[model samples]
Target chain A: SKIRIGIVGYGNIGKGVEKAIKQNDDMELEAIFTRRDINKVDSNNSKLVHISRLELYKDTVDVMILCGGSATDLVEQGPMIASQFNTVDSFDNHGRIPQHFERMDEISKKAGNISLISTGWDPGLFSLNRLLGESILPKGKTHTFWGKGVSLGHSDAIRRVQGVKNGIQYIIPIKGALDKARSGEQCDFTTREKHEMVCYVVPEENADLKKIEQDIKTMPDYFADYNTTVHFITEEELKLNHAGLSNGGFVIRSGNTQGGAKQVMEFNLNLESSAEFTSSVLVAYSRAIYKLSKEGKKGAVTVLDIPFSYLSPKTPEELRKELL
Target chain B: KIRIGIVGYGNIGKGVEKAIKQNDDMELEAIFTRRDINKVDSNNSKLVHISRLELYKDTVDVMILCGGSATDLVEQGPMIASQFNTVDSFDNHGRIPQHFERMDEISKKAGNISLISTGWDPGLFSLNRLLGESILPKGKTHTFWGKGVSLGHSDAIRRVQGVKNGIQYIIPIKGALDKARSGEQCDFTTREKHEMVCYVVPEENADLKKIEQDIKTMPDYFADYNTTVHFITEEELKLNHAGLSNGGFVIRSGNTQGGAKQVMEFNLNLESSAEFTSSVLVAYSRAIYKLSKEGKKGAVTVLDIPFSYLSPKTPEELRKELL
Candidate 1:
């Protein structure tokens, strides 16, 4: 039997997960879970189920892919889902991953289920790239550049600001900054020189737009170092103009060879849609989690804990013959 | 003012030629070559024979050696460094120490400066490997080359008669990656872990078998790997292989806090491998010039050059933005 996959949260990532599932012959979409009314959800051939009904499908679905926002949704949903079924999540919080991991670990272990956390490009692939980069060039610097894409966390933080109804933040990398960094010419780039933050905000009625903008620009650790710009816009304008979910970035390590020549190693991804790309990563890891669970693997794990061979449909021999 | 001289008139030399034109505060002085000075054609009015290199010692600030590592640099690198400050991309990883020691001795004695192993793999990737190991002492790192263009091999393939243009790709073996990740020492040759895939454009109605045989048997390039060659139309190669794209990954598997596994990885996707290497060489050349002006004399590698000295950007600017 194919690996029966259940998706929790039918947003951009949920739809993307469904699209990825179609490409993998070994996996099938079992159901789509949402907190919203199932009657209003529109998807072709997906079995829509309410989030409350997840426990009923513990035996039906082999893996549950949590396509929720990393800022708040995955924090609560990840452990909750892992208690019932094996789940994979794209929890993108940089600092709080360990805490999340510990929570999921306890829940998944007690329930005897498998859960993989932070399975997206940034926390997932880029994290691996950073470690690898640092390892290879211990004497060098590793810089991460994101965007020209939406910062989901920053946007969430902006929305939490007083006088702000809703908002979206875009992180844009300075042009040619990466090339300059790679050139072995030492750089001490200001946050403005490396990346900038721009936000389009929808304020509530009678909200002080100037104060809202000032608060966003002065937000510590989020916008303080960055050159941040705030644009007041209608909710309709925000939705119509900033609907695309595209995201991508680079991780560059510049180090010295043992003999002291400058060496640079870089990893990049240009994604048409962050949600879709994350879905691709989640789907692949879904295969790995399924295979691991069958082999008696339990508790929470990150992408680092899995083997590349387990994620693919091709046998190791075939993979070796084609791509290593 | 920094005056640059280029030796060897090949792909790298040409690449460095174009790179020098882009940056500021540096000017191309002359290009010295082993070939006949009279026969070599170039738009830059500074082509001269290798024998006449000594004549320009006072005029040229640093000589950039763009010679092959296998034969040329083994002899030319030390000889050139003894007379004038020089930079070379000597990419033989295993023999870097030997090359360095010899060049270091010559450079010290002659009171000139030299930089070796300045290319990407031996240059950039070497630093990466060392850094990765140092940062994660408990881990094992594995490197894989290509699913994209192999500029070195592609350049060699086009030299064959009846072959118009071609591109070569390197594929890493999955079995090798598995072995590397297992954390156990494994004996696998380069050929065992990687293979070559080539797409060649042949002349109209040309002998395809001979062309394939020539490519498969090409020395120093294709002999080791399990190579497969595909003959396609010029239009097909153009339509499909649009860019000279190439990249690979270096991944490390380690553990922390009990025996929990962790993985670290680095990757590169180059639009043009030759151009990237050339750019690095050009940057290092700047380092060589700066070192000489600072009254330093010796053979140095990427390890010796400070990051600030390599860029055209001011040290203050580099510190403010990059540090």
Candidate 2:
């Protein structure tokens, strides 16, 4: 009775998508696809499937979510996958280039499915903030910036550390890691409980903290290659084992009024779970797509193409009378 | 510089007047208040001044509707470049104006009382939802609409209860404005249709919800009041399409670029109820004016207009003023 969904490229967003669909009354998860070996990584477990077997469950999944993977990879394979499923939505966080939509549309159209791209927080919501700020401060232009607090936790922390083989470490002292052991490698997992250090090191051939990081991610098979925005930094705390992961921050937007008065907005990102919010936005696209698909709209439809009020999840009968 | 006009010089109208006068790029060319407190008169009906273009045509670049005749304003609002409206005094059925693009079409047929929802609730809330949805990568989303003047202890609401973002009170409002009170006197909030403007101390933001509950909790404070605050049902967002509390809030959580969890929420509040309402329109008209300047003519709703594109580049003075 729910929209059955198949996800390509499982990562933070993919996991978020899975959680959102499972929890939602309207959505169901059909399958998850990732390059990592399924049996070894504790995170993948039995839920993940090989791409070759996609056809087996293709009929059951009603939608395809392109939530993770490289832009180049997504551009090449995303639409083809959506064409097979006949519907797809992708959130490219790096930034959506205009020309990519044209190429993707061609593939999607030939296959007769829908492919939507150029969506995510910055290109997505930041633009919305500019529009809202426009009405708030009509006479002047708007300037909005984003910053994070200590959330220095990046996925690809280092390629390899000194003499580290198949090394994978969490930036923060996670309470626990998903049940996963490296394939064809013996991993040394230890922690400085006094400092709450949860770090894993693979003493492989000439693997420093950097070399084995890639191996630990792939060879050990615990981390997904989708760890794209990895940054390299030297913080004494990071040496303390898994101290470089995630720290939350603030989101602020402001615009100027005609009289040169100020109109500003602020909020904390700590309120909702990451998976829940992205799922909230992801699920919003389905209803509109289904309705529009019936109406015969082709190619890509944008977030702007849909009105904000129309996308509100629940329109209470009484509230509908008032707002509508 | 853009020329402007004013209609219905009530409280909200006065606020619009200040912004129009304050802006360097705007000019107040026409003022269409009551001719005799009960009558309506415009450049159109009288002074059939010899020339058709100069006489019959109301010549302001933009018209701001505060409180007055909806018919005349509608006829004239779009005659020029743009028009901004809050409460539509123009609808005859008059319960409360729902969505008005049907009427907007008729008005568009007529240059421009521009066809924007222009008022605080319609325009602002629409923006909130759109921006909220845009930020969320993939997940469930919940939006909270709040607008009520904060109170130390603040009543009749007769300061008749005004709270909400999208909800509109269909009833006519009759009460004091800006009389914020505090102390042992129980605070009251009522839910009839009206604007929400609260009073807060020098710097501390008023506890808008507590005062909302206070007036709601104290029966003696609202014994005879017909409509009082029994506002939104938080869990379902199914309260009366109700009203904007003036402030807008949006929360979103989901997977982002990182394997890391990404969550976001933004809260917006403009201090004065009346001034903010007027300023909202003022901002809109200028943005609309930019569209017409771009060689894109005719009336368009806030739904399509890329307002930021229409924005006049801010000056160093203005930019520095924005914190």
Candidate 3:
């Protein structure tokens, strides 16, 4: 039996998912639906599915992966699939999960199917890894996770990209709100141990107390058992007069004692392009979904819940060989 | 005009020899001592007479002292001056009068001038002012002088060595503690406006206790004056992490052992490059020349000399001429 895969919205990640489906032996590209006639659709692999809203949902696709700009397209057409598909897995590289979940929760609850949202490198696999590490630690202990990596040349652009006014306000809080936040303990967690994440504007600026506090407050589900922090490092400090740009990854460590008995896990994924890691994680995750479906186990789940065998081969060398 | 003769063929003597040849006002007619003729080629005027000290009377008008230890200058210089009936002089021949006293009668007979050490603050005018200001002494005076290069190198070393060990040895004040403890007579003075002082030493090895003692006691020399010495390293230490050393000088007012002790340490330690140290000595010599030309000779010092004499009057003037 062919494993059917449906892709909606034809963009960067959409194109990547199509390529990954074609490359994988188990998964077969079924049909793709876009608002406009893309004209560049893969003709040899499969034909374009119907464009009408009703006809798109009527198509019997086992798993539908939505990838594209997350705007009115998802809001308008997402409900049609919610009513039709028995099992719907969303792969949204664009940050539209919160808005989509909020709007479609009613239909989603009726169908007894969950919408897996906000799954990417840092916020996706990175978050899941931190949560699993936190679960192993003893209860009632403070945890601090710090990560530093290098990004070259695009320092100015990175600063601007991360420089939303609200993000800046969270990183460096002003007087009145900061005082109130401190007094009320208006953080994302009830416990003293909270997630704090900071992305430095420049290589020289390290993690500060304010940035750490902001990370704790910014996590999706504010829970005592779950705390995470993140920071970006750039090659400006490391390069010897080299004008080009490069980026490094981060580490997550948590415990109560100072440099004592504590568990530390660090993961650094480096690539030339910004979207490379995101695309790879999405493709790997899509494979994991296909395997789970083949075994008849399908529900909304995170990368944390996936078995190690599903993610890696038997041995470390074997795993590296497989990944490489 | 006096015809000057040089004795040694070392670095210091070579400098004096060159200066004398360059100067239109002075003459270097002879050189003494013995070295391989091939190795001792005279680079300047060929008219220079070469002979032994016994025949100095016929060859030169006066002697320009060069190098040798204090003991050597005290013994040999007076003998040569007396024999030649001319002057024997040298700069930074430590404790000039005490060394001169070794051959006092001979010196008086020779009736020749012996210009002692010259350089930077101490040799130039640091001590000269100490003598001049004693006549109307009312309060303590403080003196500070330093020269540095490669700020990056100095800063890196300062960080590693810590401020305490690097430049904190320059302050001189140890007796004030006894006065304070014993309830002896001590004077009170206030820091004047527009006079801000900072004592910087390497952060790690600096001894604040010693620095405080020096600052408190330095002002006791003048019944009405109070003085303070803050030890500080050069600012270049904050730049880059390359070379890790800095040197500079400091002097506190007063003629006591404390004052002399501080001055000595400062002079010995303050140096950026060996060449700069030599330049400092030359500047001190120039100060002496200016004082002698102005007939303001008897025991001059740094505080009496105008500060403008230390640096060129206008840096722009040089650029203008080049342009």
Candidate 4:
């Protein structure tokens, strides 16, 4: 048996958390806080046990799993709610976190409780994956990337790209370009609308900006629904000055040792998920917290604050299986 | 400034040379070839072409032995890297590079470093497969590497192992409860007639609870794969499955934690091994020269380096006047 658990702000991800908590034998669903009917059954087909706002403190919850909502009042109340127990929080990129990060850390630390804010995927597992990947190449010269492109059948195109610092666009229209549209070149002009082709553009030195203009014509969009695929490149990668497209992304980490040996590690993730990855990291950290109960790691921490070998729980069997 | 040397003039060599020219800290020096040392662009002005190792050996600093033949270039690589700069390399093949054991031993004795077998699958993809394998180390680990739906290439595992189209790999955990197979994922929902367990369950120990969480994280086994993972509970998985592929390997680590794991690594993909593996050596050359200036002197793997050393040096720091 494990400690009693509490969930706040029951919504889409909340329903998933409930299903996950129910699935594991180690966790028990103590109560859920929401303005709606508490008696409703979740996707797990289990009834929700509702609790009053004041009762969140009076109830015997060991810790709370914060999900959803990022309002000013929520941020103001987040620390008080976090101090309820040793917590695993999903900071909604809220006001407190990233800005007054120490304020939250100190609030939780003073209560002698563990509160890891911004514990979603990125600030959580994404950072961990980055740290794990970066662990191999720590110094010297380097290159990295964030990129995306589209094979728009005709109607949609690369409206804009985001999260990309440095980029290169190497696109050519297989069908037709705009200037080419009316230049006595009729290669089925009816279907070709957006730019014939465009790359994310380039290092400028490698780029044919005048050429990119000669090709497409419009600047990129920050957001879109069906036509464009926006690439939100990270800080390190844009600095690497690399270019790539399609659905996947690449990371090339190169550095040298104090002893003079230089090594490079490059990884490309296919079918990159912005959130499903959060699922794995969630369970991974929960398992980490389970162990911390005994190891005595209190106060706020991140995924890197944990270890790789510690991702899974050690059963009495694992201890038996693990040769000391 | 570090002067560099090239061992080949092929597509692979051309790429590494271009990368070296871009960095401000390194310079292209001399080139070694059996012959045909044609002119590369003007930036290679002082670049000398030597037919034999002893002809103009005094001018070189570091060397990169490029291409797939794996023997001559590799054997020649050592006499250079051990006493001077490290060798950045790999052997992308249809066979194991048994020569690597010899490669490792020689480099260690010389107190020099040589980084190899990186980029794409062997590089980043392999690390992913390692993470996938570690997820369920007690069970068998199966992996397939190839482009999307591109099959019917030359597959040896099928010709000899009797493996065929539709489904790839299936290895179940041994210690699970509720040990029942399901129909959701097992059935590929297709026309070729899939007999693999329409889908697959858990064990009998405390490991059961741990695995429950692992699956919840991964949720599913396959992701656009010659590379899919299968966890079945039954000892006898005599199920016929699906799919066509270029070629891939299935590494089944032993039943215990730190057992002698086995691997079936082969590369007969419809694509070129060079397409996936060439970029890192250029990156490594940059890493080598950069690190030497910092007083680091031996060999290092992609895993040994840290994050702080890998970012671009902000020019803002160079602007500060010396007191």
What TM-score, over all chains together, does every model reach?
0.51, 0.54, 0.31, 0.40
Per residue, candidate 1 scores C-alpha lDDT tens digits across A112-211 of: 9989888778787676556545433444688889857986789899989999999899998887788787666556777778998899999999889899
Better of 1 and 2 by DockQ: 2
Tens-place lDDT digits, model 3, residues A48-151: 65456535554566656656444566456655565554233343433554445454556545655443344555555444333422322221122222222232
A156: Cα error in model 3, Å: 12
The TM-score of candidate 3 is 0.31
Q: Evaluate all candidate structures by whole-model CA lDDT and list the values in order.
A: 0.73, 0.46, 0.38, 0.42
Error of 2 at A87 (Å): 5.1
Error of 2 at B134 (Å): 11
TM-score of chain B of each: 0.77, 0.53, 0.43, 0.48
After superposing candidate 4 on the true structure, give the runs of residues whose Cα lies further than 4 Å from its correct spot: A1-276, A282-324, B1-5, B21-30, B34-63, B73-78, B85-87, B92-112, B131-276, B287-323
Write model 4 residue lDDT over B1-323, tens digit each, in one string.
66777666665566556556545566777655454456534425444454444454445555666644555645665565555555545544322244345445666676555555544444444434433333323333334343322212212112312122222332223211011111011212211211112112234343333433322232123221123324444443344222222223323222211221222111222122332233345445555556656666544444333222332343122111100
Highest lDDT: which candidate? 1
Q: What is the interface RMSD of candidate 1, in Å?
A: 14.0
DockQ metric for all predictions: 0.04, 0.17, 0.00, 0.03
Top candidate by DockQ: 2
Q: Which portions of model 2 miss their true places by more than 4 Å?
A: A1-4, A30-49, A53-62, A69-72, A82-96, A105-114, A139-251, A271-276, A313-319, A322-324, B1-6, B10-31, B35-64, B68-264, B269-273, B282-323
User: What does the lDDT come to for candidate 2?
Assistant: 0.46
